[PDB]
Amino acid sequence: AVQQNKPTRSKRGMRRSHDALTAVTSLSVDKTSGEKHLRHHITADGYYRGRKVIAK
Amino acid sequence: SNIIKQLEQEQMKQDVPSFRPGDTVEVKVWVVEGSKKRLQAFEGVVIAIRNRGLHSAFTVRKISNGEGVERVFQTHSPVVDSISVKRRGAVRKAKLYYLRERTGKAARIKERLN
């Protein structure tokens, strides 16, 4: 339950090769305000698909 | 599913009467002994009814020779020739499984007047 020989920076990097994040593919642009928002998420100012859904 | 629904309804019986748990019924079921086919009567209290269309069943319990016997009839099986309610019992349940521990005075199902 413990290593016999110290793994290299080579193997550490090889293992971490799958730990890279993935950038958001492309933000959507609200049709009325023009703001940028995550797809299927309401905009920061409260707009979604061309309507004001939440006050403030 | 619809296809299964018509397949069941093509075989379901239509003569089955209305009975309830607590009813005493007698069920005449075909017995094929030897080459000859006859009818044998099984009479007792109905203790469970499972309604699933063609897959409906019911449990009849009797006390034969001091030996309780339970039998689960498939309501639509051709072997189950006929059913008749010899007495209407009144109980406040849907499965009378407490009658297994009861016998005699403590296994009496009150009549249902209406």
Partner: protein, 118 residues
Amino acid sequence: MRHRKSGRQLNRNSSHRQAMFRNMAGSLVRHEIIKTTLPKAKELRRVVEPLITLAKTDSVANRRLAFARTRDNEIVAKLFNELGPRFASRAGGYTRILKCGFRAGDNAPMAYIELVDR
């Protein structure tokens, strides 16, 4: 396996889940829009909407049902006096879910849940 099973456990016991959704349904009725975690909203739909369906047809028995659930006189009065007549013509889907990003504290996907006539 959970084949065909329904309802989310939400990392709670049954009593806590029942009480939490009673409180959430009360809050959603009272404020007509609340901000929750997305699965909590997706499970609060199944609790809130039957309350409105119950409130559609008014009776003392239905009032006692909608009070056995929820357990607030203010909420049941609001149900039967507004949300019943307001939704009398709508055949379900009284609630709308709008995903609104993520929570700062724990990166929980959050959503607003709203009554559709608010």
